[PDB]
């Protein structure tokens, strides 16, 4: 609205500052403690209410993070607490707020609401309408970013549909339709191949002559994602290559006698693999946009020889699916909403794994520590796998956050074959950091394969365990 | 209704006597055969748990009495 420009005097605070949260939380907890201590007993009859108030304190049951709080009233020996004295205490909370300005929004129904998460009998109910699909916030009237950054929001739609228990065959199938709709733009026009989206964490359906609906969307993104499905499908892929004239004379240690370079160049798998690593940010004009477009077209015109040094160093490791692990939680227990035996794959993964019920400095010091070279402490100690294996930029993905990756890394990924020691998988006593990366390379395929998460054992490293990590050290020298 | 549609899925997942038996009675890819082979072992190792073998959700007319 033009001609609308003024100033205004309030007593309120700014909306989203940082220090405006902490002191409000302190002020929440202090007034709740003096409620339960002093104002409580001094303003009520009905000694059931008095006995209820004198039994709880805010260290034992009160949790607050902002304006909102959650107070928990535990069960006694006789069962649950009488649900009428709780309401008589609720009226006293509402009366207590009026004496100094707070207008509480107390609620008592039998559920729990805290940080806008909805539970009933321990339920994990997702709010599907918390974020819409076709909805985006715009505060100003300015134009938006150019075209090749819309795919980040499309992947955001997909990863937000992951955490909510959608019908997974329908959800992946609709994600493909969006994924293929947002792929071409006028500038020869620009176009992403379909493998560039597989790099971004999007699972597939049926490729290379395989079974349909064969992988899961719990697969990671990046090189750890590209390792897993290839290492699961590889003896079928090397058959499908030879199935139409893609034979060379020498045998590769990975794909055998088939020219993976020509097959991947003609099918444009390499070009999607390297084209997905281009920056989608038009960093600091239409001519910079044209610079980014020419940089993006150059990756499509260039023909490629192999994958990155990290993925090629990964692909020498072979695992095995011997036997399924014992379950971690009851099948008939409703843990999480939406997922059920009708939603088959998360229902299998969440029972077999179990739900979670229990940076530049850290990078570069490990870069200089693993290569031959607090600062006096780091040299000999070790950290866990999820911290020690960040030296090759491996991270537990966004998808595995609502599961138990700790027990899976610690126990159910064995770095030793079932029939003893194959003499090929001999990690030296020196350079024992390799174990923390082999944990991730093991736990990739045990999560990408649909169905039950299976106990996985080490089988083979082709170049030897000593010569395996020299490739990682070459990547560390090359940065 | 969904109450039947979920029960059919539970019965599709959980599926399949005390007598002496008679003579009458490297790498691998991923296959739906191997998926079912893992799932049946998982359901068997869950089904033979002793609390699962006895416990039920609804008490009967003897337990209520």
């Amino acid at each position: 609205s033009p001609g609308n420009d003024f100033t205004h005097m309030t007593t309120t605070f700014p909306s989203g500052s940082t220090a405006t949260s902490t002191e409000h939380t302190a002020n929440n907890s202090t007034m709740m403690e003096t409620f339960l201590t002093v104002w409580g007993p001094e303003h009520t009859d009905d000694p059931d209410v008095l006995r209820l108030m004198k039994s709880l304190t805010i260290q034992r049951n009160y949790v607050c993070q902002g304006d909102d709080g959650l107070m928990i009233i535990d069960g006694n020996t006789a069962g649950k607490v009488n649900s009428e004295t709780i309401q008589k205490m609720l009226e006293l909370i509402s009366k207590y707020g009026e004496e100094f300005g707070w207008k509480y929004d107390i609620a008592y129904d039998g559920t729990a609401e805290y940080l806008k998460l909805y539970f009933i009998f321990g339920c994990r109910i997702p709010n599907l309408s918390r974020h819409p699909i076709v909805g985006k916030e715009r505060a100003n009237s300015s134009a938006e970013e150019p075209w090749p950054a819309i795919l980040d929001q499309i992947m955001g739609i997909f990863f937000n549909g992951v955490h909510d228990g959608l019908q997974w065959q329908r959800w992946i199938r609709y994600s493909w339709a969006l994924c293929c709709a947002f792929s071409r733009q006028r500038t020869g026009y620009l176009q992403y191949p379909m493998w560039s989206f597989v790099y971004w964490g999007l699972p597939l359906v049926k490729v290379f002559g395989s079974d349909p609906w064969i992988f899961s969307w719990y697969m990671p993104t990046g090189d750890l994602g590209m390792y897993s499905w290839i290492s699961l499908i590889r003896p079928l892929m090397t058959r499908w290559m030879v199935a139409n004239g893609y034979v060379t004379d020498k045998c590769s240690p990975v794909f055998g006698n088939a020219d993976y370079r020509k097959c991947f160049n003609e099918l444009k798998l390499y070009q999607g693999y390297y084209m997905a690593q281009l920056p989608r940010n038009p960093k600091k004009t239409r001519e910079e946009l044209a610079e980014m477009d020419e940089t993006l077209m150059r990756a499509r015109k260039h023909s490629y020889s192999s994958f990155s040094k990290l993925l090629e160093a990964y692909l020498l490791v072979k695992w095995r699916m011997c036997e399924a692990r014992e379950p971690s939680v009851d099948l008939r227990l409703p843990l999480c909403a939406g997922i059920d035996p009708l939603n088959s794959d998360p229902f299998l993964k969440m029972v077999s794994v179990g739900p979670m019920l229990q940076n530049a400095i850290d990078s570069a010091l490990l870069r200089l520590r693993t290569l031959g070279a607090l600062a006096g402490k780091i040299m000999l100690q070790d950290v866990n796998t999820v911290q020690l294996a960040r030296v090759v930029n491996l991270a537990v993905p966004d998808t595995w956050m609502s599961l138990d990756f700790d027990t899976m890394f610690k126990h159910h990924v064995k770095l030793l074959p079932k029939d003893g020691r194959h003499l090929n998988t001999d990690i030296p006593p020196r350079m024992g950091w390799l174990r923390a990366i082999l944990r991730f390379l093991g736990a990739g395929m045990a999560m990408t394969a649909t169905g039950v998460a299976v106990d996985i054992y080490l089988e083979d490293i082709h170049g030897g365990g000593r010569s395996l990590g020299q490739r990682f050290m070459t990547w560390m020298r090359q940065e | 209704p969904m109450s039947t549609r979920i029960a059919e899925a539970t019965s599709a997942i959980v599926s399949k006597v005390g007598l002496p038996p008679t003579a009458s009675s490297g790498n691998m890819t991923l296959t739906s055969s191997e998926i079912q082979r893992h799932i049946t072992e998982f359901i068997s190792s869950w089904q033979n748990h002793p609390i699962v073998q006895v416990s039920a959700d609804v008490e009967n007319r003897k337990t209520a009495q």
Binding site: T238, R239, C251, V254, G256, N257, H462 | -
Partner: peptide, 18 residues
Amino acid sequence: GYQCHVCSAVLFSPLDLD
């Protein structure tokens, strides 16, 4: 006329397979 189990290379005759 099947493949190997070391490097997954396919063969056509059983002689060079062996």
